[PDB]
DNA sequence: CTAGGTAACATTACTCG
DNA sequence: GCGAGTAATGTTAC
DNA sequence: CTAGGTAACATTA
DNA sequence: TAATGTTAC
């Protein structure tokens, strides 16, 4: 696995072909059984992971016991890069939820590659900006809106993780997350997330067949609003 | 021109690009109570604050406000829509009479791509922000209001100190409780009774303008047991 | 069942010709 | 040395 | 005053 | 067995 295969992942897309193909120069394989830790939020991160198979959850856990699911990453995802670029410890907790395999990249190699072909820095920056926006809109979502709108804005944001650049009218969606996973992302409780999803359905915002939600984008945008 | 080292991002530069090539600020000022730019807007310019207080905030159609930051001297804002083609991501309001220096998109970026280990600086900044913002998000999501206030005081104290943390540290906070309610995504009266709560529980004491925080009582109000 | 939001009212505190 | 314009703080009843 | 949390219980593939 | 739905408070 080293073609134009490295263009599938965020950040690494957007590279010149030289650094790219030559870039499976510095991956090692690894794998993690279903239900195990890759690393913890305390930890030292001198390696960045790139996901080939499986589902890995990035989440914040609090001493009280509470969880904020930051992301569920599957094939084509990139995580663990902040503590690479920035001297700081890991900023979240990475758990394999199902049997997963990826490729790891070292700190010294990566960074040398950045500083060697420096318009790749540019790529990485456009990524961190992207994240910062994503995260601030999450924060606004959780702060200024109620739970129905929170769920609505979650569906519209993922229906931009799929379309984006703009948006039909009725779009089916394979969501792959349980409602416990949605409760964890939205910083709410399972039963109330459930009643909210059902609410969106009974109000004509969505309908749910098994694995598939046909969302009504717009019909969903004013539930997301007033 | 070691004056350009006072601001985030620009600190951390080689002296060549720093004293020079910055070369590329215009003066500008904004009266107390006015808009610099709006969240819709096109941002091809980045601001660097010399005097005054400017609030960066998100406003919703419903009318609600999330204060993202109150920046004063030594602050840098408006850089995301520079680096990234996208519109402005928040709303910048001068709360008091403010003055700054503006830097254009084309100049800035040319400077990045000309001395490329400055990119490195900028990245360490965006990482910093991303962490800051995710810890905010965790704060607002997994904790109650007393802990939210507590974690706000510790974050502003780890910004003044950081890398050390004493035991009792006084703090000049400069924000009203309405400003704290707006940052924490809560309501003024409940923020007030929370602050008072921290005081009556021995976490802080408030003299006029100054809060002597007790870092550690304050850390387990920020937590459980 | 509970931590908060909202409207409304009273004081203190800045502050500016 | 104000008196008139604002805020900022604290509390209470929904 | 009331969204939204919590503990528990039922229906479902 | 896990995923979804509901209820009382
Ligand atoms: N807000 C966020 N959005 C998406 N991914 C994040 C966020 N915060 C942290 N991460 C990822 O989680 C990783 C945890 O370890 P690092 O902090 O080394 O690198 C981090 C990022 O790759
Ligand atoms: N999470 C955040 N934390 C601090 N400042 C932010 C955040 N999001 C946006 N900003 C600032 O607000 C500015 C709004 O316009 P820009 O998006 O051009 O640049 C932005 C940043 O300077
Ligand atoms: Mg969102
Ligand atoms: Mg905080």
Numbering used by the authors:
A (entry chain B): 6 to 231
B (entry chain A): 8 to 232
Question: What text comes from the article?
Answer:
In contrast, both cyclic nucleotides mediate transcription activation by Sinorhizobium meliloti Clr, mapping to cluster G of Crp-like proteins. We present crystal structures of Clr-cAMP and Clr-cGMP bound to the core motif of the palindromic Clr DNA binding site (CBS). The structures show a Clr dimer that is bound to CBS-DNA. The individual subunits fold into two domains linked by helix α5 (residues P123 to L149), which is the Clr dimerization interface.
The cNMP binding site located in the N-terminal domain is stoichiometrically occupied by cAMP and cGMP, respectively. The binding modes of the phosphate and sugar moieties are identical, involving G85 and E86 within α4 as well as R95 and S96 of the following loop. The nucleobase of cGMP is flipped to the syn conformation, while it occupies the anti conformation in the Clr-cAMP complex. While cAMP interacts via its primary N6-amine with both T140 and T141, cGMP forms hydrogen bonds between T140 and its C-6 carbonyl group as well as between T141 and the N2-amine. Interaction of the cAMP nucleotide with both α5 helices has been described to trigger a coil-to-helix transition in the C-terminal part of the hinge and to shift the HTH domain toward its active conformation for CAP. In the case of Clr, both the interaction and arrangement of the full α5 helix are resolved by the structure, which is in an agreement with Clr-DNA binding in vitro and activation of promoter activity in vivo by both cNMPs. The affinity of cAMP binding itself by Clr is mostly not affected by the presence of cognate CBS-DNA with equilibrium dissociation constant (KD) values of 6 to 7 μM. Formation of the ternary Clr–cAMP–CBS-DNA complex is enthalpically driven with an opposed loss of entropy, whereas that of the binary Clr-cAMP complex relies both on enthalpic and entropic contributions. The relative hydrogen-deuterium exchange comparing the apo and holo states also shows a slightly stronger decline in deuterium uptake within the binding pocket for the cAMP-bound state than for the cGMP-bound state. Furthermore, Clr-cAMP produced stronger band shifts than Clr-cGMP.
